[PDB]
Amino acid sequence: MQKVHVQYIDGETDQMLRQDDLDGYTDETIPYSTAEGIKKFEGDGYELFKDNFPAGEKFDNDDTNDQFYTVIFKHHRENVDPNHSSADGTKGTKTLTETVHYKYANGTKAAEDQTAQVTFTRNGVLDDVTGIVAWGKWNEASQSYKALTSPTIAGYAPSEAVVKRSSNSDAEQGPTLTVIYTAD
Ligand SMILES: [Ca+2]
């Protein structure tokens, strides 16, 4: 009897996913199609790259050696929006917070902090096999915080009347700064 092995391969990770064995008679047409196996793996996110099983291939007349044929896949990808989830828990969004403290010259507190927030977004490409999104560059190079008006405190003037700042998309946290109140 002759033997044939059809090997289903992830060609991105060079990993064998399954092997199907068949036996037959010399010169018999190999009674196999890669169609079901291709359908199955495409259902798990793969995309056919190269099917090396030849149409109408016969079993050989070589007892010593088996026949091997690979069916090679890549990972199917699709572009996704910033709101898309990812199996590795990474996100297409981030929100940074600006914090402004209000103090007198000795560091004692003059008023309660005010805060503001900015949000950045990034598109990505989802790998259908892994469920993981490869996120691209942040779409906005920077974002500006809403203007924060320092409170009016009788008898004092703030070092900065209205605080306007921005964050760059590479920042991991927004700015934290102090407005100082000086006596009139
Ligand atoms: Ca053989």
- How many angstroms separate the CA atoms of 163 and 150, rounded? 7
Residue with tokens 């091997």: 68
85 Cα to the center of ligand 1, angstroms? 49
- My answer on whether 85 and 71 are in the same domain is no
CATH number at residue 84: 2.60.40.4300
- Return the DSSP state at 122: -
- Return the DSSP state at 14: T
- 3-state SS, 134-176, equals EECCCCCCEEECCCEECCCCCCEEECCCEECCEEECCCCCCCE
36 Cα to the center of ligand 1, angstroms? 24
- My answer on whether 26 and 94 are in the same domain is no
5 Cα to the center of ligand 1, angstroms? 10
- 3-state SS, 40-97, equals HHHHCCEEEEEECCCCCCECCCCCCCCEEEEEEEEECEEEECCCCCCCCCCCCEEEEE
Return binding residues: 60, 62, 65
Residues 20, 26 contacting (CB under 8 angstroms): no
- My answer on whether 8 and 93 are in the same domain is no
Residues 165, 135 contacting (CB under 8 angstroms): no
CB-based contacts of 14, cutoff 8 Å, min separation 6: none
Number of domains into which the chain is organized: 2
The amino acid present at 35, given as its one-letter code, is: A
DSSP 3-state helix, strand, coil percentages of the chain (rounded to 5)? 5, 50, 45
- My answer on whether 112 and 38 are in the same domain is no
- My answer on whether 71 and 81 are in the same domain is no
Which of the listed residues 41, 75, 109 is the one where a domain comes to its end?
75
Which tokens hold the place of 11? 């060609």
Return binding residues for Ca(2+): 60, 62, 65
52 Cα to the center of ligand 1, angstroms? 17
- My answer on whether 21 and 69 are in the same domain is yes
Count CB neighbours of 96 within 10 A: 19
- My answer on whether 23 and 110 are in the same domain is no
Parent domain of 169: 76-184
Q: Record the resolution, in angstroms.
A: 1.8
Residue with tokens 């259908």: 128
Which of the listed residues 52, 75, 98 is the one where a domain comes to its end?
75
- My answer on whether 64 and 100 are in the same domain is no
- My answer on whether 58 and 9 are in the same domain is yes
CATH number at residue 14: 3.10.20.470
Quick one: CA torsion of 113, 118, 124, 127, rounded to 10 degrees?
A: 30
